[PDB]
Amino acid sequence: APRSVDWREKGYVTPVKNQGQCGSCWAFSATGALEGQMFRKTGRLISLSEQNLVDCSGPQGNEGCNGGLMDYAFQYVQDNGGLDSEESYPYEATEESCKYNPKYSVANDAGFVDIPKQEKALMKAVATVGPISVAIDAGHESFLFYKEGIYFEPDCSSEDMDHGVLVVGYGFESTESDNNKYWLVKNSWGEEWGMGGYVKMAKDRRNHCGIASAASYPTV
Amino acid sequence: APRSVDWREKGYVTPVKNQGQCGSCWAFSATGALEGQMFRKTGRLISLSEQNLVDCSGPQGNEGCNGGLMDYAFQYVQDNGGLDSEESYPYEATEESCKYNPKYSVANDAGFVDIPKQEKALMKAVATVGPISVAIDAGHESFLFYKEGIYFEPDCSSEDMDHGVLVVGYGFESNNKYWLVKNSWGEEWGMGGYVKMAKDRRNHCGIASAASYPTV
Amino acid sequence: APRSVDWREKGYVTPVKNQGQCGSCWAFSATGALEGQMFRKTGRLISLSEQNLVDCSGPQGNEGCNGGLMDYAFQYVQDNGGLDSEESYPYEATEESCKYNPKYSVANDAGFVDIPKQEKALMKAVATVGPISVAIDAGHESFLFYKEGIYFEPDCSSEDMDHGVLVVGYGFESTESDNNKYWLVKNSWGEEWGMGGYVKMAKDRRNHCGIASAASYPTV
Amino acid sequence: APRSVDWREKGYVTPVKNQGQCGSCWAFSATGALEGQMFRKTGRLISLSEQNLVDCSGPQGNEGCNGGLMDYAFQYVQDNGGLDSEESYPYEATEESCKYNPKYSVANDAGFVDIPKQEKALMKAVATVGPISVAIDAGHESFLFYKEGIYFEPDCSSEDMDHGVLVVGYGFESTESDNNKYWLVKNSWGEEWGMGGYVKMAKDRRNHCGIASAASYPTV
Ligand SMILES: *[C@@](O)(C(=O)NCc1ccccc1)[C@H](C[C@@H]1CCNC1=O)NC(=O)[C@H](CC1CC1)n1cccc(NC(=O)OC(C)(C)C)c1=O
Ligand SMILES: *[C@@](O)(C(=O)NCc1ccccc1)[C@H](C[C@@H]1CCNC1=O)NC(=O)[C@H](CC1CC1)n1cccc(NC(=O)OC(C)(C)C)c1=O
Ligand SMILES: *[C@@](O)(C(=O)NCc1ccccc1)[C@H](C[C@@H]1CCNC1=O)NC(=O)[C@H](CC1CC1)n1cccc(NC(=O)OC(C)(C)C)c1=O
Ligand SMILES: *[C@@](O)(C(=O)NCc1ccccc1)[C@H](C[C@@H]1CCNC1=O)NC(=O)[C@H](CC1CC1)n1cccc(NC(=O)OC(C)(C)C)c1=O
Q1: What does the record list as coiled-coil region(s) (chain B)?
Q2: Ligand 1 binding pocket, CB closer than 6 Å
Q3: How many structural domains is chain D composed of?
Q4: Ligand 3 centroid to C120 CA: how many Å?
């Protein structure tokens, strides 16, 4: 793979959003990945509606503000034949009935690809596909208060991921030989969290925080 | 009262502590306030045991990691006749049976003083007494994510406080005046663990509505 | 020696100060070290006057806002027979004539000790003496913007130190690169810089930024 | 966490070994932790070579029979790409030139985790990771002479440790008793010392003998 990747510089990534007090991180991970793949297919970046997923993707297994899975969101988009734009179907941070309108659909997918559960495979997918939906163990005070640098949490689990986010690149700090490597990760807690709403997550430390345990992207 | 106050400069304030995953903010606010009044009385700054309060002040109304009140903690120290040092009774972030040892008491109090619920009264207290225990509305993600600057949260309620902290001073922009507030979330939170809260903005986050300190 | 030391927890360290736009970092390093040794002796923590050093220790070789050395400041306090409190002789961030007044002296020393130029000797001094004055290379953008974590600058020189600061302890934390040890360093750029005015400088990494190359403390 | 943990009952722990008159306690603590993480990852318990560490991990900071650190041993395994089995590279109790052969490597790691200096942190790590390397203050004749019971030494330091051992569990005096909890600790002085070569060290008594002051384990 390339030594570093940052899909923001290629036009694939919308600004950081804020999910508010609703357990919809999975929907923000899913729209981020679908935004990237739609741009890859069309050359146009269009922010997509998390609310559409929160309200409408129950039949695929999602539970609105009580949690969900990015793969279930990609399955909804496939089953439904579409997903509305963020502009047409804005985010309210609470679960309501479905108001999908196919006239405002700006995305589609044909299913999804689950990446093999190791970081070399994840790197190859980030480098060759675009931004990748992942699940991480974010269940630590240290994650809430993250400011800068490469996030490494000694109590992180590679099995108990609880938070959906989006890998938009990877790279290294310091001298390359120091192996000070990170994943560049877009969160959905607004730009006041973290580094402008981003976190650099420990990379190539045997799947730290489970970042490679449940990674996928939609097929467009 | 002076235009600005910072009790850290006069030796009244211990380093920032970390309560961890236990709902014991009330105990850190209490030890903070008692640490300051004990220094005011004796000239000695000794870090005091939050674990002692978590484990032992049930009879006064406190519920350990499930919450509590600074005044109930001050009441416990009075009833108990003392309070152990932090070093003698260190913090475990979980509730256990009481292990108080009078031989390791380093602090006492004779009750407590609740301050009238106005920011002018709070300012006089800070200026003349020392660090003051206060309750604030901290239930907003903006407070979780705070790092620098003067904190102001549109959605902050002046009547639904949920978090005990310690006012160690106040200052001005030059009016975006502020209270200098020690938290108990470790040094990585906020400005080395401190937050500047909006001062004189309609009792922002209820900072003056439940202010108090122990009588030493 | 211990694996972790923090003299702030033992009462040896005043709050972070702000030297402003005057090249007086050496004076703040010196007062911090003497504040610690005076506390060790008397049990009383008294903030000391940097302005007294800036205005008055020229005869020992210091040059006010144009630079100085902690050892010259310790020599001044010895030669002069005292040093005024911060409250009696407050900081103006500009060089003026000497206004030292012995009636307001609150500190003394009988010289200083220069520590051998090895991080292991710095460690034993920090462990057994208290806060130690040191000189570091702080001339890098990364140092200005430091917010948290262990500071490591690949371009840092161990021979061109330009900045006096104060080691108040040392410790460890898990990191991506497994360079986990740090010196806990008090700066003089106010509380808004770094972590409450502190930085965790890389420890046991080939004398990173020269932190063990010009270490000393006053003899009280 | 569970109220009691004993990783020996899960297959994570090799029999007690005897370091002899060589200052290699750090190498035994390290192989013990790596034996546990290799079992966690592969389901196979294979005894590992302390001799390989004694002879070969000088480049990482270790000094053979003159002392060393578990973290440096874990770094060696990462740098070296492997570690030989006990059987392939048996223990000689004296420093020799390195005889590592990659054909007999049975263990690997990608660095290590230093646990924060709290007994509650150590408790969580033991409950969720497996056996943990620790440093303790063993510099008392009471430790030399230990045979049975819960070890408590009034002169024990919580800051200055001198001996590397392996926490394999923890336990209690009785279900509803805060008193006489213990860490279950594997030593490397053979099975005639202590309790079949194990010691129950006072737990939750102000981090007794420093057991939580320098705890770590390899990343696998
Ligand atoms: C997501 O992390 C999120 O929206 N975070 C911000 C937030 C947290 C809590 C409340 C409001 C906002 C989301 C949070 C969940 C749903 C509600 N409470 C939570 O903890 N996480 C998930 O939806 C997460 C996504 C998958 C990729 C990892 N998720 C989905 C489905 C099930 C679970 N967990 C689960 O079943 O856990 C057990 C322990 C089995 C109950 C899950 O975390
Ligand atoms: C305190 O704010 C705290 O420890 N914060 C960090 C923290 C929060 C949650 C979990 C772990 C750590 C503390 C937080 C409480 C206890 C656990 N959950 C909470 O929300 N706040 C209090 O203990 C607080 C203190 C008073 C001075 C302001 N407090 C005391 C007693 C009762 C309540 N709340 C309450 O009764 O709320 C309702 C919902 C009305 C029952 C309270 O906040
Ligand atoms: C100190 O770092 C400081 O006050 N920094 C903040 C600051 C910088 C510039 C202007 C205002 C505030 C201090 C900075 C010096 C003096 C003014 N310009 C500087 O760069 N550093 C020292 O005084 C430093 C202390 C020793 C322990 C390291 N110091 C002392 C004496 C000489 C030099 N440098 C020097 O002669 O450099 C050459 C290249 C030869 C001119 C020095 O850095
Ligand atoms: C280990 O404890 C051991 O092998 N003990 C049995 C033994 C003792 C003496 C001689 C032969 C066998 C080991 C003992 C050391 C090496 C030889 N002399 C000793 O006392 N301890 C260490 O290697 C220990 C490991 C760390 C986790 C605690 N260790 C490592 C590095 C440095 C030191 N000490 C040190 O620097 O001490 C001072 C006095 C501060 C210089 C250390 O003990």
Answers
A1: none
A2: A 19, 21-26, 66-69, 135, 161-164, 214
A3: 1
A4: 26
Instruction: Please give the resolution of this entry in Å, rounded to 1 decimal.
Output: 1.8
- CB contact at 8 A, D50 and D24: yes
Can you say whether residue C140 is alpha, beta or left, with left for phi > 0 and alpha for psi between -120 and 50 degrees? beta
Reduced 3-state DSSP string for chain B: CCCCEEHHHHCCCCCCCECCCCCCHHHHHHHHHHHHHHHHHHCCCCCECHHHHHHHCHHHCCCHHHCCCHHHHHHHHHHHCCEEECCCCCCCCCCCCCCCCHHHEEECCCCEEECCCCHHHHHHHHHHCCCEEEEECCCCHHHHCCCCCEECCCCCCCCCCCEEEEEEEEECCCCCEEEEEECCECCCCCECCEEEEEECCCCHHHCCCCCEEECC
CA A84 to each of CA A47, A89, A130, B43: distance values in angstroms, whole numbers, following the listed order: 9, 6, 21, 66
Kindly report the CATH number assigned to the domain that includes residue C178. 3.90.70.10
Instruction: Classify C218 as helix, strand or coil.
Output: strand
Residue D139 in contact with ligand 4 by CB distance below 6 A = no
Residues of B in contact with D120 (CB under 8 A): 20, 92-94
Which chains does B contact via 3+ CB–CB distances below 8 A? Answer: A, C, D
Contact B94 D206 (CB under 8 A): no
Task: For residue C98, give its domain range.
Answer: 5-219
Nearest CA, atom 34, ligand 2: B162
Q: Are C46 and C85 in contact (CB under 8 A)?
A: yes
Give Cβ neighbours of residue B74 (< 8 Å, ≥ 6 apart): B30, B33, B34, B109, B111, B112, B212, B214, B215
In the set D187, D207, D208, D209, the catalytic residue is: D187
Distance CA(A8)–CA(A169), nearest Å, equals: 8
The torsion angles phi and psi of A89, rounded to 5 degrees, stand at -145, 75
| Residue A147: both structure tokens together | 């400011």
Cα distance between residue D204 and residue D170, in whole Å: 11
CB contact under 8 A, D120 and B96: no
Which atom of ligand 4 lies nearest, measured to the CA of D28?
Answer: 4
**H-helix or E-strand spanning residue A47:** none
The b-or-e profile of C187-196 (16+ CB within 10 A means b, else e) is: bbbebebbbb
Pull the structure tokens for residue A137: 């163990």
- Written as one letter, the residue type at B5 is V
Report how far Cα D156 is from the mean position of its chain's Cα atoms: 19
How was this structure obtained?
X-ray
